[PDB]
Amino acid sequence: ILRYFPTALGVDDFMARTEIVLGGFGFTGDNTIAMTNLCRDEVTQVVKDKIEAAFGSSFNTNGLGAVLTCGVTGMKAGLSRERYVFFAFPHIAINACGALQKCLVELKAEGVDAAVRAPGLHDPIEPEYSILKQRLARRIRYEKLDPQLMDLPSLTALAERTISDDLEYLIEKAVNPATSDYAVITGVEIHNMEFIAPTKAYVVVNGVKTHLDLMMVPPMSFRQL
C-alpha cells in the first residue's frame, strides 16, 4: 500500500491522531459537529462509521468521486462557541473509485482541453459526473499536468486537492471564523483493510489558522496494526 501512498495510516490510527490534535485545540467529541464528504460508493462506510462514533453530532454529504454539490445551502443546513470539523476523502482500491476510473479513461482519450467547460455548466442527465469531470479537467490544466502520465492514484490525488479547494470555498461562505472555530482534514481513503492517507490538516480557532502534521503525532499503540 505504502508503495503508492507513503503517508497512508490505518483508519483507527488516523482517528486517534486526529482526536489527539483536536483536543489540543479545545475540540471534543461532544462540543463539535463534524461533517463528512465521501464518494457515494458503499465501500466508504468504515471511515464514516468511525467518524460518527467519534462525534456526538455528525452530518454527511456524498457524490460521485466525493464531488461537492451541496453548496453553501447544503452546508449551512447540515450545521445544528461553535465548533466544526470538515472531513473529505475520495477513495481508491489497492491490493474504487469507479467514477474516478471513468474520468481517467476519458481524460486520456480526449484532451484535457476537450473535457474542460466553464464553471456553472453541466450535463442535464449527468449532473454530478459532468461537474466532477469538469473540475478535474480545469484543475489538471491549472497545474500543467499531463493526463497521459497520470495513473488512477495520481488522479484520486488530484481529486482530493480539487475537492479540498471546493470545500474551502464553501466554508468561507458558510462559517464566521470570528464566532466559530473549525478544523479541516482531508486526504485519500484506501481499501485493501481500510486506510487514510492524510494530505491536508489545519485548524482555525479565533480566526487564526494553524497547520497540523498528523504524521508527526505519536500514535496510540492500541489503535495501530
Write out the binding residues for Zn(2+): 39, 91, 97
Least spacing, CB of residue 74 vs Zn ion, in Å: 10
Ramachandran region, residue 65 (left: φ > 0; alpha: ψ -120 to 50; beta: rest): left
Question: Using CB under 8 A, which of 71, 153, 177, 219 touches its own copies?
Answer: 71
Least spacing, CB of residue 173 vs its own copies, in Å: 6
Least spacing, CB of residue 62 vs its own copies, in Å: 8
Q: Does 22 bind Zn ion (CB under 5 A)?
A: no
The owner of cell 501512498 is 5
CA dihedral 62, 63, 68, 72 (to 10 degrees): -60
Q: Which residues are annotated as a binding site?
A: 39, 91, 97
Question: Which segments of 25-97 does DSSP mark as H helices, in order?
Answer: 45-54, 71-77
Question: Using CB under 8 A, which of 102, 108, 141, 223 touches its own copies?
Answer: 102
Q: Which of 53, 72, 70 is nearest to 61 (CA)?
A: 70
Q: Looking at beta carbons only, is 39 or 112 nearer to Zn ion?
A: 39
Give the three-state DSSP class for 175.
Answer: coil
Q: Does 97 bind Zn ion (CB under 5 A)?
A: yes
Q: Does 41 bind Zn ion (CB under 5 A)?
A: yes
| Class of residue 42 by CB neighbours under 10 A (exposed 0-12, middle 13-18, buried 19+) | exposed
Q: Does 39 bind Zn ion (CB under 5 A)?
A: yes
Q: Does 126 bind its own copies (CB under 8 A)?
A: yes
Q: Which of 42, 19, 57, 30 is nearest to 223 (CA)?
A: 19
Interacting residues with Zn ion (CB under 5 A): 39, 41, 97-98
Interacting residues with its own copies (CB under 8 A): 40-42, 59, 61, 63-64, 69-74, 77-78, 98-99, 102, 119-131, 169-170, 173
